[PDB]
């Protein structure tokens, strides 16, 4: 859209300032190769967690590291119906978290969705296309949730007409 343009430009510019990932083997365990932002084992391989917010309640928290990036998104939820629909939709997104290679089966507490892009995802898959996917999600999620809301309204109207027709 055109009301999220500076917010999305800032988010995209912060995404490709992180996502400069490198291969790294663990220090606190013999031969494991684990994402350093998930284990939080070494405090020297962790960059500052940067927040980019459009208003009080829509934001992106980006936690960088040497071989991983965790991007948590707190989406706009205006009323209770949008909250229910956003919850169910994010849940149906988590369900397939092996088809989405950069997704995370559980969101970071306080945030609606979370992506975890390690270094293998930037070595075996296009980096700019991952950035584009994140920005496209942030662009289109509000529109899709609004269409869900309109679908619920239409279902309510059809149910009312199906009842009051028999009288």
């Amino acid at each position: 859209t055109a009301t999220l343009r500076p917010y999305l430009s800032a988010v995209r510019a912060t995404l490709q300032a992180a996502l400069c990932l490198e291969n790294f083997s663990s220090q606190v365990v013999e031969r494991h190769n684990k994402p350093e932002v998930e284990v939080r084992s070494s405090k020297e391989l962790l960059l500052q967690p940067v927040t980019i917010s459009r208003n009080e309640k829509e934001k992106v928290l980006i936690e960088g590291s040497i071989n991983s990036v965790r991007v948590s998104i707190a989406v706009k939820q205006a009323d209770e119906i949008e909250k229910i629909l956003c919850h169910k939709f994010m849940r149906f997104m988590m369900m397939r978290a092996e088809n989405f290679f950069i997704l995370r089966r559980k969101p970071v507490e306080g945030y609606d969705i979370s992506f975890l892009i390690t270094n293998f995802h930037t070595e075996q898959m296009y980096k700019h296309k991952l950035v584009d996917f994140v920005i496209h999600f942030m662009e289109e999620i509000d529109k899709e949730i609004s269409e869900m809301k309109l679908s619920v309204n239409a279902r309510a109207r059809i149910v009312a007409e199906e009842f009051l027709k028999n009288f």
Binding site: F89, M125, E144, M148, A156, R157, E162, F167
Partner: protein
């Protein structure tokens, strides 16, 4: 299934099985089946004092007191004849079928036995239909506690019958979707040229509930049907009673199917987002052709 049905399946099944076993001449076996229904109704089909020849079907309702009022058993008596007996201890209505005195055409009595709850409701409801048919204004108006936290205020006038549902849902998601399902309920009168006047309110209770004990509050919704003498005549009052009886349960049913409806659209959009992600996976240069099972091709 769009519209909820009024006949219970377990009663019909059990009584038809017992009547087939009795009509073929087999010796009767014991029966003790307890179950439930909508609105907290409790059924119990058993035998009186281990007498394997009689089957007693008892029902416990929530409008306990409104059915004990004088004249609230005209329909029950009229429809059930000699089957209506004294209630079993702990229950409210009770039918008693003797497996040796069953009349012919055993389908009709079972079709009327599966609608025991509908008939108990229509018996306490046709009182006001008659109070309106006989041309008397100001007849008795009551509050049927058809549930435990919701009420149905019935009033009969010279020219109409007003039914005010005071309704509230238990779960938070159900409350949030029910606000919508009840706001959009006046848009139904565009589907038929003859539908009762429906009014919805959740800011303040109607002026009918200011002298009565119908449930009120800031979390309750009020839905007023105004049934006119074209919906309460002696030929189209069966459908009207069925609908006014199953309205709340039908709304609850469709609120709970709305979620299974939305889940399909959410799966579709999830796949549509996966297709946008797929632009990040670099297309392979050569793939090995496999089999339906997944094993190597084993040939060119």
């Amino acid at each position: 299934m769009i519209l909820l049905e009024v006949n219970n399946r377990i009663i019909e099944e059990t009584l038809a099985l017992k009547f087939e076993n009795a009509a073929a001449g087999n010796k009767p076996e014991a029966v003790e089946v307890t179950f439930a229904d909508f609105d907290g109704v409790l059924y119990h089909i058993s035998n009186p004092n281990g007498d394997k020849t009689k089957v007693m079907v008892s029902i416990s309702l929530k409008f306990y007191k409104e059915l004990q009022a004088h004249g609230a058993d005209e329909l029950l008596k009229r429809v059930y004849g000699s089957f209506l007996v004294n209630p079993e201890s702990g229950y409210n209505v009770s039918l008693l079928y003797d497996l040796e005195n069953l009349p012919a055409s055993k389908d009709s009595i079972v079709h009327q036995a599966g609608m025991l709850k509908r008939n108990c409701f229509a018996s306490v409801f046709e009182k006001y239909f008659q109070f309106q048919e006989e041309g008397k204004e100001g007849e008795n108006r009551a509050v049927i506690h058809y549930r435990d936290d919701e009420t149905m205020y019935v009033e009969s006038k010279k020219d109409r019958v007003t039914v005010v549902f005071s309704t509230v849902f238990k779960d938070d998601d159900d409350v949030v979707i029910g606000k919508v399902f009840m706001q959009e309920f006046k848009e139904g009168r565009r589907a038929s040229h003859t539908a009762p006047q429906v009014l919805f309110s959740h800011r303040e209770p109607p002026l009918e509930l200011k002298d009565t004990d119908a449930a009120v509050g800031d979390n309750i919704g009020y839905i007023t049907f105004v049934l006119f003498p074209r919906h309460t005549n002696a030929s189209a009052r069966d459908n009207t009673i069925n609908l006014i009886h199953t309205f709340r349960d039908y709304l609850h049913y469709h609120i709970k199917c709305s979620k299974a409806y939305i889940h399909t659209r959410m799966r579709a959009k999830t796949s549509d987002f996966l297709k946008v992600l797929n632009r990040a996976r670099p297309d392979a240069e050569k793939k090995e052709m496999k089999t339906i099972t997944g094993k190597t091709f084993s040939s060119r």
